[PDB]
């Protein structure tokens, strides 16, 4: 029917979209910077593939979520 259906409230209170956008970006950006610094300073004999993979994956995850929340914060509501 239509009477026994609950209203569809958002999973994340919209007032939390700004607070969540900055943080998730900042952390992300930080890690990103680290990665790039690591790729300029370290020579061929001082590079670890597992460390690079780990830091790059963390940066990618945090950055994806931050970019989503920002894109939704401006009002595109993807």
């Amino acid at each position: 029917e239509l009477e026994a259906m609950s209203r569809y409230t958002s999973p994340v209170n919209p007032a939390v979209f700004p607070h969540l956008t900055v943080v998730l970006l900042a952390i992300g950006m930080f890690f990103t910077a680290w990665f790039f610094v690591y790729e300029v300073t370290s020579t061929k004999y001082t590079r670890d593939i597992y460390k690079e993979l780990l830091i790059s994956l963390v940066a990618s995850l945090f950055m994806g979520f931050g970019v989503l929340f920002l894109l939704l914060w401006v009002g595109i509501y993807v």
Binding site: E39, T43, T46, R47
Partner: protein, 138 residues
């Protein structure tokens, strides 16, 4: 950052690379060894040491100094740069200073007299020698 694509490889520019890698390794090892020695001397020689944990720390420091000596000999023989004279001098001075400071601490913590000003002077001399070694290690 994994593709070379170079035709004429210059070994003179690769020698500098295989020197930089080594000196970074040695700096890490020496800083870690100094930190470990200071931490062991501060956490095992407060009021009772019994010369057992101090002996284990001395054995670990001797093994670390031996590994550093092997790395210094490797960087002296194999690579093109000298990296030996200053390195061997600093390694010998640091090993002697660490052994002397450990002996003074183990004698002051297991005697009738409690050396406080002498221990402070020993720590200050160790920090001064470490500062000179850091100025000499670039």
């Amino acid at each position: 950052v994994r593709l070379d694509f170079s035709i004429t490889k210059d070994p003179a520019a690769e020698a500098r690379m295989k020197v930089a890698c080594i000196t970074e390794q040695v700096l890490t090892l020496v800083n870690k060894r100094i930190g470990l020695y200071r931490h062991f001397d501060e956490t095992v020689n407060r009021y009772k040491q019994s010369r057992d944990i101090s002996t284990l720390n001395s054995g670990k420091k001797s093994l670390e100094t031996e590994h550093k000596a092997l790395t210094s000999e490797i960087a002296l023989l194999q690579s093109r740069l000298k990296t030996e004279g200053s390195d061997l001098c600093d390694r010998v001075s640091e090993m002697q200073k660490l052994d002397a400071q450990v002996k003074e601490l183990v004698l002051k913590s297991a005697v009738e007299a409690e050396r406080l000003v002498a221990g402070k002077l020993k720590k200050d001399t160790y920090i001064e020698n470490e500062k000179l070694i850091s100025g000499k290690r670039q």
